[PDB]
Design a protein around this ligand. Structure first.
Ligand SMILES: [Ca+2]
Ligand SMILES: [Ca+2]
Ligand SMILES: [Hg+2]
Ligand SMILES: [Hg+2]
Ligand SMILES: [Hg+2]
Length: 333
């Protein structure tokens, strides 16, 4: 460990009424172990604290002792991941939580079993809580991960692939590598496969000195791993960006002698955001459980544009999902 982790614990405010059960379930320990498995980096220590005034189905995450997000988890119910309105036709009244324009639908255990037979996918409450936390923690990676962690990882790798590390370091500094890794994690891409990441840096770093651009190439190299992560072991649920919207973005792109950036009139960008908002508004699958699909040329710009309003909606390129299996496009923007 380094200071990055060691000096800055995460705090979960939980209901007093659930504390003992969350201890028994080893919430804190399992969050830490699973996150490491899933993303390849270590979280800080996780402290539980009883939260004043919390109902029985609420959790708050504090980073740096500051409230970051409040989650609703129906501990005694089941979440319907691929909900549709058809469910109400069957005489089920779900329990519904909304955060922004994302909606979450919960049913009884008995109702769940019924729904499964009709091909709905269910998630248990602790599994949902872990997903919520993980998504939010990935985004906030810079709070607990940096050069010290990167250097450790490089050192571990070196012990195994010395010549590979040698080559990479000739073309990228530790700082630059750390930046690449943070940018991957912040977009929910795992860094567990360090060997592959390093092979891609050895290929690309000699030639690409702009960090944003470099990251895009690395993502490309890692395509299989990105896809497998997002899709889990299930179908990939997606919203497609229309050729129309792609073009608005494309026209706004300016190439320089340095970085490539998006340059849209503020009114124009606001109007485009209003359109994206409108198209997303009536979705019944939560944003963290979706991806937006677009062309490689516009992917990173679309991500930057929407992340203010829609922080939990990741954006993949068509190439990134080349190894996909079942894909379900639920909507076009
Ligand atoms: Ca119900
Ligand atoms: Ca407006
Ligand atoms: Hg169940
Ligand atoms: Hg969530
Ligand atoms: Hg995949």
């Amino acid at each position: 460990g380094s200071h990055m982790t060691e000096t800055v614990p995460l705090i979960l405010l939980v209901p007093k009424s659930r504390r003992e059960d969350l201890e028994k379930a080893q919430l804190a320990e399992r969050l830490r172990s699973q996150f490491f498995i899933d993303y390849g980096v270590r979280l800080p220590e996780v402290l539980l604290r009883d939260g004043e005034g919390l109902d029985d189905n609420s959790i708050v995450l504090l980073i740096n002792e500051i409230r970051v997000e409040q989650f609703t988890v129906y501990f005694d119910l089941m979440r319907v991941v691929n909900y549709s309105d058809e469910v109400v036709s069957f005489g089920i009244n779900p329990t519904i939580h909304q955060q922004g324009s994302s909606q979450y639908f919960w049913v009884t255990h008995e109702e769940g079993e019924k729904l499964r037979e009709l091909g709905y996918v269910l998630r248990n409450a602790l599994d949902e809580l872990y997903h919520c936390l993980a998504v939010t923690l990935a985004r906030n990676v810079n709070e607990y991960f940096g050069i010290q962690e990167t250097k450790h990882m490089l050192d571990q790798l070196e012990a195994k692939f010395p010549d590979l590390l040698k080559e990479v370091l000739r073309h990228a500094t530790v700082q630059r590598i750390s930046e690449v890794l943070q940018r991957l994690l912040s977009e929910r891409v795992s860094v567990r496969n360090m060997k592959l990441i390093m092979e891609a840096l050895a290929l690309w770093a000699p030639r690409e000195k702009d960090v944003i651009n470099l990251v895009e190439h690395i993502r490309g190299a890692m395509a299989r791993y990105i896809c497998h992560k997002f899709a889990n072991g299930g179908e990939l649920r997606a919203v497609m960006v229309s050729a129309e919207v792609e073009d608005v973005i494309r026209k706004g792109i300016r190439q320089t002698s340095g970085s490539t950036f998006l340059s849209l009139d503020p009114e124009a960008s606001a109007n485009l955001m209003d359109l994206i908002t409108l198209k997303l508004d009536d979705l019944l699958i939560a944003h963290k459980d979706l991806v937006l699909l677009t062309s490689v040329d516009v992917r990173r710009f679309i991500k930057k544009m929407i992340e203010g309003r829609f922080p939990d909606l990741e954006v993949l390129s068509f190439g990134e999902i080349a190894d996909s299996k079942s894909v379900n496009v639920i909507k076009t923007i």
